[PDB]
Design a protein around this ligand. Sequence first.
Ligand code: CL
Ligand code: CL
Ligand code: CL
Ligand code: CL
Ligand code: CL
Ligand code: CL
Ligand code: CL
Ligand code: CL
Ligand code: NA
Length: 129
Amino acid sequence: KVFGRCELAAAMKRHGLDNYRGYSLGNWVCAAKFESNFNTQATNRNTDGSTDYGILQINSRWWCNDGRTPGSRNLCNIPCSALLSSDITASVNCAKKIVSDGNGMNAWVAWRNRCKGTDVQAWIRGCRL
Ligand SMILES: [Cl-]
Ligand SMILES: [Cl-]
Ligand SMILES: [Cl-]
Ligand SMILES: [Cl-]
Ligand SMILES: [Cl-]
Ligand SMILES: [Cl-]
Ligand SMILES: [Cl-]
Ligand SMILES: [Cl-]
Ligand code: NA
């Protein structure tokens, strides 16, 4: 599923991501925009052979099991395929664990390079929330 901007803002908020670990809703929408372009089915291979899955491009190196990432963990206790669902529950639950791991949203390199410090509220501008 390819979410609209406000549609995703609403789903993230409904699933309790808004201000989770002190990160306003705009941060999470901005991250999803640059990680996946709001596409739940997005997958991208890393140079190290791990893969990033879903709206927030959760990495198989630590967080989910895809069966082809030697040496990795599955700290979210899910198949990476669960992270591609039209329903964002698995992605949100797993993102809450990631953002709690110590480095906040810096875990998402695209968030650090493209969202951090910017006017992230623009991402939820005009949304009925
Ligand atoms: Cl957009
Ligand atoms: Cl915001
Ligand atoms: Cl694996
Ligand atoms: Cl393969
Ligand atoms: Cl594990
Ligand atoms: Cl699995
Ligand atoms: Cl959803
Ligand atoms: Cl933080
Ligand atoms: Na893994």
